[PDB]
C-alpha cells in the first residue's frame, strides 16, 4: 500500500494473508473471508501454483511477525478460478479458496458482506484498500497491515486513464487524480472495502495498475457486484 498508515488490530477482520510454502514460505497475496470455509481473492495469484497443498491461509493477523512455524493456519482444499480468466488486465480476475476446515468467527476474524445486486446504483464514498504490499515499486512486504482511503473512479474516467486497455464494467477503479495512494506489489487479491449504511461491503478485489499510485493511473479492481452470481454458484453448489 502506497501512502497508507498502519491498521489497528481487528480493524479489517475479513483480511487474510495467503502464503505459499514453495520453494520457501512467504506471503503470496491478500484475500477476504466471505464464508466460513471461503476466501475470495485474485485469480492471478495462482500463476504457476500447481496444487492447493502449498497454500496456507492466515486470518486474525495484524503483523506478518505473528507468523512462525507454530502459527495456526487454514489449509486449502480447492482453488476455484473463474473459467473465463486469462490475465488480470483482461478481467475475470477472481478466485475462491475452499478451506480444509471452518473459520470460527470472532472479533479477530469474520466475513465481509458481498455487495447487493440492488446496490449496483449506490455511490460509495468511504472506500479503503488494505494489505502488506510494497510502499513503492522497489520495496518489500510490510510487517504491519496498511490501509489507505481511496475514491472510486467512474468506468468512463478509468478508460480515459488506460488508453490501449479495455476497462469493462466487470472492473472498478479507484485512485486520486494526482496519485499518491494505491495498492502495490503484494496487495493483490486483498479487499477494496466500502462502508455504506454502517455496513462494510466487499466492492473490489485488488488486481492491477500501471505502476503504483501514479498521477492519473487509478488502481484496477475486480468489480465484485458483477460476480455475486458466480460466487453463489461456486459456494452454494448443491
Amino acid at each position: 500500500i502506497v501512502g497508507g498508515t498502519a491498521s489497528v488490530r481487528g480493524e479489517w477482520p475479513w483480511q487474510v494473508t495467503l502464503h505459499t510454502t514453495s520453494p520457501t514460505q512467504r506471503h503470496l497475496c491478500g484475500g477476504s473471508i466471505i464464508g466460513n470455509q471461503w476466501i475470495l481473492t485474485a485469480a492471478h495469484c495462482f500463476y504457476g501454483v500447481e496444487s492447493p497443498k502449498i497454500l496456507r491461509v492466515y486470518s486474525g493477523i495484524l503483523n506478518q511477525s505473528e507468523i512462525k512455524e507454530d502459527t495456526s493456519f487454514f489449509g486449502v482444499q480447492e482453488i476455484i478460478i473463474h473459467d473465463q480468466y486469462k490475465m488480470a488486465e483482461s478481467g475475470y480476475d477472481i478466485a475462491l479458496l475452499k478451506l480444509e476446515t471452518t473459520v470460527g468467527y470472532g472479533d479477530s476474524q469474520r466475513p465481509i458482506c458481498l455487495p447487493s445486486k440492488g446496490d449496483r446504483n449506490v455511490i460509495y464514498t468511504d472506500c479503503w484498500v488494505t494489505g502488506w504490499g510494497y510502499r513503492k515499486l522497489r520495496d518489500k512486504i510490510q510487517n504491519t497491515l496498511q490501509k489507505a482511503k481511496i475514491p472510486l473512479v467512474t468506468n468512463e474516467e478509468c478508460q480515459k486513464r488506460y488508453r490501449g486497455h479495455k476497462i469493462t464494467h466487470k472492473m472498478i477503479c479507484a485512485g486520486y487524480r494526482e496519485g499518491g495512494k494505491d495498492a502495490c506489489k503484494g496487495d493483490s487479491g486483498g479487499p477494496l472495502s466500502c462502508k455504506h449504511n454502517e455496513v462494510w461491503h466487499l466492492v473490489g478485489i485488488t488486481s492491477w495498475g500501471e505502476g503504483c499510485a501514479q498521477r492519473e493511473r487509478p488502481g484496477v479492481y475486480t468489480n465484485v457486484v458483477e460476480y455475486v452470481d458466480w460466487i453463489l454458484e461456486k459456494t452454494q453448489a448443491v
Partner: peptide, 6 residues
C-alpha cells in the same frame, strides 16, 4: 449481510 453464504 443481504447476500448470504451457507
Amino acid at each position: 449481510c443481504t447476500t448470504k453464504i451457507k
